[PDB]
């Protein structure tokens with residue numbers, strides 16, 4: 001017994017959301033500035049409207065997934081009178097401050113609001129292993145959980161809508177850091193004719209052990225105390241110089257590991273040479 | 286039946302190697318510049334020698350795990366006459382160039398040689414899930430695999446000893462990048478009273494999906510072609526600005542995500558705004 005659902009925004013991610021809702025048996029209505037992106041969805045049973053307003057009017061449950069929140073206000077400004085009694089689930093990326101403003105704005109026009117963060121690329125939409133993080137009122141999340149569950153694993157962080165976006169940017173920073181370090185290392189072994197496809201399964205496996213380091217170091221970060229029982233900042237400064245040397249000789253730009261070395265040196269200068277790497281957080285605050 | 290084994294270097298890692306060998310039933314001999322670090326090992330059945338030479342003479346199988354390769358040459362130079370017929374397994378961190386030199390040097394004194402990289406902190410030594418990467422001759426690795434298996438999962442990368450260290454520095458760079466991005470995000474959510482121990486399980490889970498991004502992007506890196514089918518560099522530049530804004534307002538140093546943004550901007554300027562993030566490798570060569 002799924003409800004009628006509308007998706008506003010049919011980009012890479014918006015499309016995928018609409019396709020999953022469609023396959024889950026929802027009557028699916030869509031809108032996008034560029035109508036051509038709807039074509040494949042329409043062929044499969046989605047209704048395309050000419051304007052956002054008609055799309056909003058067509059369903060009690062409205063998802064937005066556009067570039068940013070300015071665009072959201074821009075495309076929905078003409079529909080504000082039609083929002084009353086609706087639920088608006090905003091899966092657009094933004095900052096905590098934008099998320100809290102958007103909730104106030106939606107409530108001012110009589111709509112229920114949840115702010116969400118999609119922790120997957122488009123192929124994983126629909127997979128219950130992929131996290132979707134939500135902030136907003138309990139009641140709204142509980143009433144709509146079953147529909148959200150179509151898209152992935154819906155995790156309600158709490159009543160503050162900014163929480164979703166807070167976790168999101170923190171998690172994205174983690175992702176960009178990992179991707180770039182991976183790419184740097186891949187360039188390095190690649191200069192020796194080791195293919196990325198050969199190296200990467202070792203990287204993937206290694207990330208399991210690295211995730212274990214995160215688990216170990218969490219209670220250290222909360223305590224502000226970083227015992228060097230496993231490996232020390234000083235030892236890590238010595239080994240990063242091997243990375244820098246190897247990369248420099250193979251034509252790989254070292255901005256990233258230079259910065260990481262500097263951050264370790266900063267922590268050492270602050271008295272953390274014999275502490276664990278988690279002590280590096282002392283020089284990020 | 287396990288062989289007699291010597292460990293040279295009883296730091297955080299060297300200790301752990303010796304403790305595992307001891308528990309596996311090996312007659313275990315040890316040496317360290319600072320003898321007091323041997324005490325707990327001696328109490329449990331390890332023999333401590335006064336010099337490295339006596340330690341080398343005591344076993345057919347010698348592991349070295351000291352700060353760096355200069356220290357290795359320094360402590361082993363006086364034992365070169367005792368190396369003949371031995372196997373020397375060097376688990377010291379270093380560069381590929383150092384690894385190849387060390388093999389030539391060990392061969393010149395009649396020893397078999399393997400170069401290794403420990404992909405775990407000390408607690409994981411002994412666990413068959415933890416990767417130990419090896420480079421050096423097939424025959425040597427095959428003859429000694431059973432002893433190496435006591436320490437972890439021994440993976441022979443091939444005949445070139447520099448391969449172990451090549452993968453190692455690349456993998457360490459990945460680890461440092463991940464840890465620092467994790468810590469930056471942890472600082473961020475921590476300003477809002479979300480503990481590291483609350484945030485980290487989300488980070489760990491997220492890393493599974495990120496590892497999947499690495500798998501997808503590997504064939505793109507090898508091809509030099511980066512289709513923007515999932516998510517684009519331009520969209521990622523927009524979302525990293527939400528991270529920068531959120532972090533700046535909460536007293537978190539933004540050197541890291543500023544560099545990551547710059548790297549994405551560099552890729553965009555080179556024509557990769559519509560490509561996947563893997564295109565960023567184009568700007569690291």
Ligand SMILES: NC(=O)c1ccc[n+]([C@@H]2O[C@H](COP(=O)([O-])OP(=O)(O)OC[C@H]3O[C@@H](n4cnc5c(N)ncnc54)[C@H](OP(=O)(O)O)[C@@H]3O)[C@@H](O)[C@H]2O)c1
Nearest residue numbers: 009010011012013014033034066067092093118121515516
């Ligand atoms: N792709 C991912 O893996 C992923 C994952 C998690 C979160 N997200 C987030 O989801 C959101 C959308 O991302 P996407 O990857 O789907 O990006 P995308 O393919 O570039 O789509 C951007 C969407 O915004 C619309 N748009 C942009 N400017 C507009 C304007 N001035 N007026 C009306 N519509 C406008 C686009 O319409 P046109 O089609 O007419 O240009 C399109 O629907 C972003 O906040 C992104 O950070 C993406």
Ligand SMILES: NC(=O)c1ccc[n+]([C@@H]2O[C@H](COP(=O)([O-])OP(=O)(O)OC[C@H]3O[C@@H](n4cnc5c(N)ncnc54)[C@H](OP(=O)(O)O)[C@@H]3O)[C@@H](O)[C@H]2O)c1
Nearest residue numbers: 230231294295296297298299318319351352377378403406
């Ligand atoms: N800990 C880890 O998690 C880990 C993981 C993988 C690889 N590694 C690598 O293992 C190696 C040793 O690491 P560790 O973590 O055991 O660090 P550590 O606890 O600082 O050990 C350093 C070792 O080197 C010796 N040493 C240093 N300078 C010396 C000198 N001038 N003469 C003689 N001996 C000297 C030390 O002897 P004293 O005790 O007398 O100072 C000690 O045995 C490094 O290459 C490191 O990158 C470590």
